[PDB]
Design a protein around this ligand. Structure first.
Ligand SMILES: CC(=O)NCC1(c2ccccc2)CCOCC1
Length: 165
């Protein structure tokens, strides 16, 4: 199973790791993608997960959007995990760099509660522009299921652990 994680709470764990490398190693039931409403996996975690699937995630996602239309900010959809996981839970956290309501981050994390265990990034962190310390706090206060957080940046990982209340 998951190794080398620091336990933050009863159900939240954290590790300084590349979520792609973590997913290829563990092959979890669910890997969370930091998705946008259009499932356009261009950069950040989404671009990296999609590149690891040889673009199969994007092809599947475009068919999903053609059929269903875009997701809501704070919403999610379950698609294939391809070579990374059994499933990919595409979750849309608010993108602060697009003026999206940061209060939608709790709604985004509520999607994790439909899955008993997940490998995930911090929602709305990175290129989504939110404060990762705030994202971790919303995660621990919202998610009740077992969440294994992969934080790519070592310096951010150390700051998150050292400042965790
Ligand atoms: C494995 C486990 O007990 N998970 C905790 C929660 C649960 C409770 C009972 C049945 C299934 C899920 C997750 C959903 O929110 C409520 C607690």
């Amino acid at each position: 199973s998951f190794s080398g994680y620091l336990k933050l709470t009863d159900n939240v764990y954290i590790k300084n790791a590349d979520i792609v490398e973590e997913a290829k190693k563990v092959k979890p039931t669910v890997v969370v993608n930091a998705a946008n409403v259009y499932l356009k996996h261009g950069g950040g975690v989404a671009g990296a997960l999609n590149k690891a699937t040889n673009n199969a995630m994007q092809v599947e996602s475009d068919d999903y959007i053609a059929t269903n239309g875009p997701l809501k900010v704070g919403g999610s959809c379950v698609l294939s995990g391809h070579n990374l996981a059994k499933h990919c839970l595409h979750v849309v956290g608010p993108n602060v760099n697009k003026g999206e309501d940061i209060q939608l981050l709790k709604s985004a994390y509520e999607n994790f509660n439909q899955h008993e265990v997940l490998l995930a990034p911090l929602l709305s962190a990175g290129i989504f522009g939110a404060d990762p310390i705030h994202s971790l706090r919303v995660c621990v206060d919202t998610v009740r299921t077992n969440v294994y957080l992969a934080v790519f940046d070592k310096n951010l990982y150390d700051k998150l652990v050292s400042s965790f209340l």
